[PDB]
Design a protein around this motif. Structure first.
Motif, short mmCIF file in Angstrom:
data_model
loop_
_atom_site.label_atom_id
_atom_site.label_comp_id
_atom_site.label_asym_id
_atom_site.label_seq_id
_atom_site.Cartn_x
_atom_site.Cartn_y
_atom_site.Cartn_z
N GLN A 2 0.93 -1.25 0.00
CA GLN A 2 0.13 -0.01 -0.10
C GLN A 2 1.01 1.19 0.00
OE1 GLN A 2 -3.87 -0.81 -0.02
NE2 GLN A 2 -2.01 -2.64 -0.62
N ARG A 3 0.18 2.56 -0.66
CA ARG A 3 0.66 3.48 -0.51
C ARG A 3 0.50 4.45 0.58
NH1 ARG A 3 0.82 8.61 -4.90
NH2 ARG A 3 2.67 9.73 -4.46
N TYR A 4 1.36 4.81 1.56
CA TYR A 4 1.34 5.55 2.62
C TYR A 4 0.61 6.94 2.22
CZ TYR A 4 4.16 2.15 5.40
OH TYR A 4 4.36 0.94 6.04
N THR A 5 0.18 7.62 3.53
CA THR A 5 -0.34 8.69 3.26
C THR A 5 -0.24 9.67 4.69
OG1 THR A 5 -2.77 9.86 2.92
CG2 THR A 5 -2.39 8.40 4.94
N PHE A 6 -0.17 10.89 4.42
CA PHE A 6 0.29 11.83 5.55
C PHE A 6 -0.67 11.82 6.67
CE2 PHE A 6 2.34 14.36 2.13
CZ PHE A 6 3.76 14.28 2.34
N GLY A 7 -0.17 11.53 7.92
CA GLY A 7 -0.73 11.55 9.07
C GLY A 7 -0.91 12.89 9.48
N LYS A 8 -1.19 13.19 10.84
CA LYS A 8 -1.32 14.26 11.59
C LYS A 8 0.17 14.91 11.61
CE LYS A 8 -5.52 13.72 12.19
NZ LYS A 8 -6.03 13.25 13.21
N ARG A 57 -1.12 26.49 8.26
CA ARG A 57 -1.53 27.08 6.74
C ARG A 57 -0.35 27.22 5.91
NH1 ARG A 57 -4.75 32.44 7.48
NH2 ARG A 57 -2.87 33.06 8.65
N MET A 58 0.90 26.78 6.32
CA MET A 58 2.17 26.56 5.60
C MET A 58 2.51 25.11 5.32
SD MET A 58 4.99 28.31 7.87
CE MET A 58 3.79 29.57 8.49
N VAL A 59 1.69 24.25 5.81
CA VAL A 59 2.09 23.03 5.36
C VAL A 59 1.31 22.51 4.02
CG1 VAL A 59 1.33 20.46 6.14
CG2 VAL A 59 1.66 22.20 7.71
N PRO A 60 2.25 22.12 3.15
CA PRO A 60 1.63 21.90 1.82
C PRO A 60 1.28 20.72 1.58
CG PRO A 60 4.11 21.89 1.91
CD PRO A 60 3.74 22.13 3.33
N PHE A 61 0.40 20.06 2.66
CA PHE A 61 -0.28 19.02 2.29
C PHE A 61 -1.12 18.82 3.35
CE2 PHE A 61 3.60 17.92 4.52
CZ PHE A 61 3.19 17.33 5.56
N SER A 108 7.64 12.58 -0.42
CA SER A 108 9.05 13.08 0.48
C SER A 108 9.09 14.66 -0.07
CB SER A 108 10.03 12.41 0.26
OG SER A 108 10.70 12.13 -1.39
N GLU A 109 8.92 14.79 -1.43
CA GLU A 109 9.29 16.47 -2.02
C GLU A 109 8.22 17.40 -1.28
OE1 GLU A 109 11.63 15.39 -4.19
OE2 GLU A 109 12.67 17.00 -3.89
N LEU A 110 6.90 16.82 -0.82
CA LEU A 110 6.16 17.60 -0.16
C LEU A 110 6.46 17.85 1.36
CD1 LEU A 110 2.57 16.49 -1.36
CD2 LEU A 110 4.02 18.59 -1.98
N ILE A 111 7.37 17.02 1.90
CA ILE A 111 7.92 17.04 3.32
C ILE A 111 8.99 17.96 3.02
CG2 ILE A 111 9.55 15.94 4.82
CD1 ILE A 111 7.94 13.46 4.82
N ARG A 117 13.14 21.02 12.62
CA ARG A 117 13.40 19.66 12.45
C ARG A 117 12.06 18.94 11.88
NH1 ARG A 117 16.77 18.32 18.07
NH2 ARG A 117 18.65 19.04 17.31
N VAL A 118 12.07 18.80 10.67
CA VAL A 118 10.87 18.28 10.00
C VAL A 118 11.26 16.70 9.55
CG1 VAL A 118 9.27 18.19 7.98
CG2 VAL A 118 10.25 20.40 9.13
N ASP A 119 10.55 15.68 10.42
CA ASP A 119 10.61 14.39 9.87
C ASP A 119 9.73 13.70 10.53
OD1 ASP A 119 10.66 13.31 13.32
OD2 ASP A 119 11.92 15.09 13.20
N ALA A 120 9.69 12.32 9.53
CA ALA A 120 8.51 11.26 9.39
C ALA A 120 9.04 9.96 8.83
CB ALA A 120 7.43 11.96 8.83
N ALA A 121 9.97 9.35 9.47
CA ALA A 121 10.26 8.03 9.00
C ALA A 121 9.02 7.04 8.90
CB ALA A 121 11.29 7.40 9.83
#
Length: 550
Positions: free
Chosen positions: A164-170, A186-190, A198-201, A218-222
């Motif tokens: 499955q393709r993952y999706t953005f969580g909270k 409001r400046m989260v591009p998703f 990952s380019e949206l991250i 520090r923007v992270d989400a492994a």
């Protein structure tokens, strides 16, 4: 360093380079040490051959003492192994993803000579895109490379179940930042529940970085965590509340030059910004202040209030200029920004020996576009700028006014390092009272970024007594061609044409010819040009300038 030599009969540069790669450095080994080294050398060489599909290579080794010493490996390749079966399959959801590149090319079609590394390249590509697009449950179900050197056959089998393709969580925000999460979100591009990318991250990261609000993010989400949601963790380190900055520069136009800034990157929780800035040059001094309020979207939409004071003594004019203004920035997805502002100006102006004073309140708007390979060494880019504004007399204006300004900058590069540059500028002021029209609203041409061969702002019509007072209209048109001489060193050959004037029918466009050189300095781009003036009494002139090409 004892010379190592690879001889391939019959010539095969790839095999020679690969053997020269696996064998490596011999060092300063004498004859004996090379003699001990021979078996390793042949071993490495045959690894390299096997790596290029060459499994029946005759490899022998000579050693010759000398100054320095040398060891000659003879390789005699034989015909290589070619692909029979090639099955590269991406299954699962990813099978239906548009931008998921499947491994392709000549080297993976049946019949092509097999290179060992190419397969791992394909595999790496698949897994890299898997990771880019959030196919974290992607497992290789089949990985098989099979080689029979006898009869020269190779089979590739790559079956990749992507799952499955993952999706953005909270999205969560922690850190000593006082910025409300209302603004940060409001400046989260998703949005949450949107297909991972990952380019949206990355876009989120650069977004937070560019807001100016922090010194660190520090923007992270492994892959983590049943639909499966990827939580995104953002931590913010508040920037120093105040900051000072100083810059030095130089120019043929204005001479020595100093910039200063005093910035307050966050005043309150709503993300307001405060600022001060100044610049000092012999012919021109100015001071400015500004306030910014993020609207919605916070990054592309905002209000900007400004004030300023400027003294200027240039050519045959002097001016003390005071200004206040309100601005409304909004930017559409194209890359087109639209600024809608109202400006008030009061000008103390000495034109030649004639002293004037006038005041203006002009509604104006601008659009800007910019697309660049970027950002300090652009290989091609386009900039487009358009500003217009007006004065209605009676309505806080000493005269009518229709100030139209447009500017374009183009760059393209072709082949083995050549660059083509294009610049064009144009402007027209309309009025029912030219004498009431102050210098800042009149038009000047010439100088480093206008028409080289001529000094700064010397292209303007003359008054009765021969003082340059300013044109109703102006144009410049320029072209530059660069040839690569070295890294950070380019050659330049340019043509320039321009001239400001009071009559459209008689532009009298002064031509400029010139050549120069550009260096990328370890302090920034530097451009030194030598321009011959073709019109009037056209002597020679040295121009110097700094800054990005666009």
């Amino acid at each position: 360093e004892s010379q190592l030599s690879v001889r391939v009969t019959p010539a095969n540069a790839a095999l020679k380079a690969n053997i020269e790669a696996y064998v490596g450095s011999l060092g300063e080994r004498d004859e004996a040490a090379l003699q001990r080294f021979r078996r390793n050398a042949e071993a490495q060489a045959e690894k390299a051959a096997q790596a290029l599909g060459y499994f029946q290579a005759q490899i022998d080794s000579e050693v010759k003492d000398g100054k320095p010493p040398k060891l000659t490996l003879k390789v005699v390749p034989g015909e290589p192994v070619r692909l029979r079966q090639v099955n590269i399959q991406v299954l699962g959801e990813a099978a239906s993803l548009e931008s998921f590149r499947l491994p392709s090319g000549k080297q993976l079609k049946p019949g092509a000579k097999l290179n060992q590394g190419v397969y791992e390249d394909a595999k790496r590509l698949i897994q890299n895109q898997a990771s880019r697009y959030g196919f974290f449950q992607g497992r290789f179900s089949t990985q098989r490379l099979s080689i029979d050197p006898r009869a020269g056959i190779a089979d590739i089998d790559l079956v990749y179940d992507s799952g499955q393709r993952y999706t953005f969580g909270k999205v969560s925000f922690d850190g000593d930042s006082i910025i409300e999460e209302e603004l940060l979100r409001r400046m989260v591009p998703f949005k949450a529940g949107q297909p991972y990318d990952s380019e949206l991250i990355a876009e989120l990261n650069q977004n937070l970085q560019s807001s100016g609000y922090f010194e660190g993010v520090r923007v992270d989400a492994a892959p983590t965590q049943a639909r499966q949601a990827i939580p995104v963790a953002v931590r913010l380190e508040a920037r120093k509340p105040r900051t000072m900055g100083v810059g030095l520069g130089f120019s043929t136009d204005v001479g020595a030059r100093a910039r200063f800034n005093w910035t307050r990157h966050w005043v309150n929780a709503e993300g307001h910004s405060l600022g001060f800035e100044s610049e000092i040059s012999a012919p021109r001094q100015n001071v400015g202040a500004w306030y910014e309020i993020p609207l919605d979207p916070p990054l592309t939409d905002k209000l900007r209030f400004t004030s300023g004071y400027q003294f200027e003594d240039l050519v045959d004019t002097e001016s003390k200029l005071l200004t206040l203004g309100g601005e409304w920035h909004s930017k559409r997805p194209d890359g087109w920004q639209r600024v809608v502002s109202l400006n008030w100006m009061r000008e103390e102006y000495k034109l030649g020996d004639d002293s004037g004073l006038s005041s203006f309140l002009m509604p104006g708007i601008g659009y800007s576009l910019l697309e660049t390979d970027n950002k300090v060494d652009p290989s091609h880019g386009y900039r487009l700028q358009f500003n217009v504004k007006g004065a209605k007399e009676g309505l806080l204006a000493d005269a009518d006014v229709l100030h139209v300004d447009a500017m374009a900058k183009g760059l393209t590069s072709f082949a083995g390092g050549h660059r083509l540059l294009g610049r064009l500028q144009v402007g027209g002021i309309a009025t029912n009272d030219y004498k009431s029209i102050p210098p800042s609203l009149r038009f000047f041409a010439g100088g480093d970024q206008s028409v080289r061969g001529y000094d700064y702002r010397t292209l303007s019509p003359e008054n009765s007594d021969g003082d340059k007072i300013g044109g109703r209209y102006m144009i410049a048109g320029s072209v530059e061609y660069q040839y690569p001489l070295a890294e950070r060193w380019r050659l330049a050959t340019f043509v320039d044409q321009g001239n400001a004037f009071n009559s459209l029918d008689f532009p009298s466009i002064k031509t400029g010819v010139g050549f120069g050189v550009r260096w990328v300095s370890p302090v920034g781009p530097l451009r030194l040009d030598l321009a011959h003036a073709l019109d009037d009494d056209g002597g020679f002139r040295l121009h110097f300038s700094m800054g990005p090409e666009l």
